[PDB]
């Protein structure tokens, strides 16, 4: 609808440093946009503590049932729920393997931070989300990844929709306060062999790795190339 397109255009122009308040203000203004707007625009990631297993995990709509959220470690909801939504047994095994795989992925590329993977069944395959958050007094920063993958088993076809939110801020004598904030979304597609050679997690991992490397380079070019050249064109 037109109001949704206007909301999405506003989110393209309002300061990305305030994504959460922007969305909240839009939903206050036009409450009927809430569902479609929140499914179209990812929000900054939030961290919770799994006190059962002793591990941090990331929150999103995909691991939410009512007002509880499911830990990928304990596979339990917080606050506990009677019969919350849970992956099938087959997918839970894949989900455990994927969280361990992406912990290693995250360590190797991010050298810290937190990651969570949630999977769910679809009629002809399954889908999943891969979440990664890394944070940085006078030098701060935050990287948030949200990767949504759709898998259609036939061989398998993978569809990946990836959002990265990146912001950096410095406060220094020479340059004063410098703040760079932004959000970028990309998509890619791929058919793959599925075997002990390239199981689903390896196929998904390569897809996510390729996407993040590509997005990182684009962010590098825009943040530290394009806006720098614009600044110098102003004076």
């Amino acid at each position: 609808d037109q109001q949704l397109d206007c909301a999405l255009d506003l989110m393209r122009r309002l300061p990305p440093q305030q994504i959460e308040k922007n969305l909240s203000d839009l939903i206050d203004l036009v409450p009927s946009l809430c569902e479609d707007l929140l499914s179209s625009v990812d929000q900054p990631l939030k961290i919770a503590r799994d006190k059962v297993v002793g591990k941090d995990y990331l929150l999103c709509d995909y691991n939410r049932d009512g007002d509880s959220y499911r830990s990928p470690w304990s596979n339990k909801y917080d606050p506990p729920l009677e019969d919350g939504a849970m992956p099938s047994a087959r997918l839970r095994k894949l989900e455990v393997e994927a969280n361990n795989a992406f912990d290693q992925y995250r360590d190797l590329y991010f050298e810290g931070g937190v990651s969570s993977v949630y999977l769910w069944d679809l009629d002809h395959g399954f889908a999943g989300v891969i979440l990664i958050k890394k944070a940085g007094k006078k030098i701060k920063g935050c990287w948030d990844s949200i990767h949504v993958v759709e898998v259609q088993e036939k061989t398998a076809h993978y569809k990946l929709t990836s959002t990265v939110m990146l912001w950096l801020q410095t406060n220094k004598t020479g340059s004063g306060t410098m703040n760079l904030g932004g959000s970028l979304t990309r998509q890619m597609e791929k058919d793959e062999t599925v075997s002990d050679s390239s199981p689903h997690i390896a196929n998904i991992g390569r897809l996510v790795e390729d996407m993040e490397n590509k997005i990182r380079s684009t962010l590098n070019e825009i943040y530290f190339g394009k806006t720098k050249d614009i600044v110098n064109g102003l004076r």
Partner: peptide
Amino acid sequence: AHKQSFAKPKGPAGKRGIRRLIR
């Protein structure tokens, strides 16, 4: 790799509740 062009998959089936922001 390209700009948004196709739909995201549906979320987990049988989920209860509306989408909301986390604070």
